[PDB]
Design a protein around this ligand. Structure first.
Ligand SMILES: O=c1ccn([C@H]2C[C@H](O)[C@@H](COP(=O)(O)O)O2)c(=O)[nH]1
Ligand SMILES: O=c1ccn([C@H]2C[C@H](O)[C@@H](COP(=O)(O)O)O2)c(=O)[nH]1
Ligand SMILES: O=c1ccn([C@H]2C[C@H](O)[C@@H](COP(=O)(O)O)O2)c(=O)[nH]1
Ligand SMILES: [Mg+2]
Ligand SMILES: [Mg+2]
Lengths: 117, 117, 117
């Protein structure tokens, strides 16, 4: 797939997702929510969406990833919504690994109003 | 697929998930967990499960979605488990978009006790 | 698939994921993050990764699961990263259900630097 930017890294065939980098330094006080920029854009392949999910190293620090659904038609820059849900302050350095992008399949169904048994 | 209720919206072919609506007004104080009702029921297609995941607009407000696995055999009403992990109070209006439902494939394996190399 | 340990349970064909058990008692104060051990190891099938996601019963208690991506090539013991994002203390008993493991498909793409339209 075509991407733009160096905020996303190539993975091995045995890894589920691509590491995403922080485009700039970010400081987060306990309970603070910030949308961290990555500087990358992508043209997800037709029939798939992208899931942003956390990495064990940052997660074990009390940081969580909110939202996380990259739609196939999105062309904007990818942003990672992060909250410090721990009780201590944390600083993420520029170009630090903050999350992962996993490509998964799309299933489009038509909504039929009926009565579920 | 067959659904029941107007708490879930039809999506475009380029979107990954269906927007879920809050069935009633909800107030959440910092650190509060509440199971928000949607009023919708569904008959997921055989071979798939449903994943409830957050929307960027509410996530950027410090709200997170817990749990989130809708099993293929579930017929009850879908509920969205939400926590305010931010430091300020928040009110979700009736019929406000609070989450997304994405349909993904099922992989059933048999558990073989052995020794992993 | 081959596993090692009794910290993971067999599921029915209509359930999305396998219940994961806590290998030991864990106490978590509000805002505390701990990596709970399960004692299980697995040889995920080629072409799939594993997703650790929350269960409604523990999620409705204000506990969340961070990280959660089990790579196909991982052979270590599976650990569940848990945070108490609620305002009250919680104790998880030994061998208590704390999460779920769902097997999903792998999509490996090659990164092509270009210009996304
Ligand atoms: O964590 C996230 C979630 C979403 N988006 C982007 C791509 C999505 O297609 C778009 C649309 O918004 P939501 O439907 O996800 O709120 O926002 C991000 O950059 N980061
Ligand atoms: O966020 C959630 C998670 C679960 N369920 C429902 C459908 C599931 O099949 C059922 C079973 O419970 P758990 O195994 O997810 O705890 O609860 C919801 O409505 N909302
Ligand atoms: O919640 C988690 C997340 C990861 N791992 C394991 C298996 C992964 O392959 C490995 C690698 O680390 P990350 O790339 O997920 O940080 O850690 C766990 O046991 N539990
Ligand atoms: Mg979370
Ligand atoms: Mg999550």
């Amino acid at each position: 797939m075509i991407i733009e930017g160096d905020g996303i890294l190539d993975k091995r065939s045995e890894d589920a997702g691509y590491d995403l980098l922080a485009a700039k330094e970010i400081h987060l006080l306990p309970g603070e929510v910030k949308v961290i920029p990555t500087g990358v854009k992508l043209m997800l392949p037709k029939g798939y969406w992208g899931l942003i999910i956390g990495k064990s190293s940052i997660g074990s620090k009390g940081l969580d990833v909110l939202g996380g659904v990259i739609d196939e038609g999105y062309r904007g820059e990818i942003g990672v919504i992060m909250i410090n849900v721990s009780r201590k302050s944390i600083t993420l350095m520029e170009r630090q690994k903050i999350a992962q992008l996993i490509i998964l399949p799309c299933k489009h169904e038509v909504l039929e109003q009926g009565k579920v048994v």
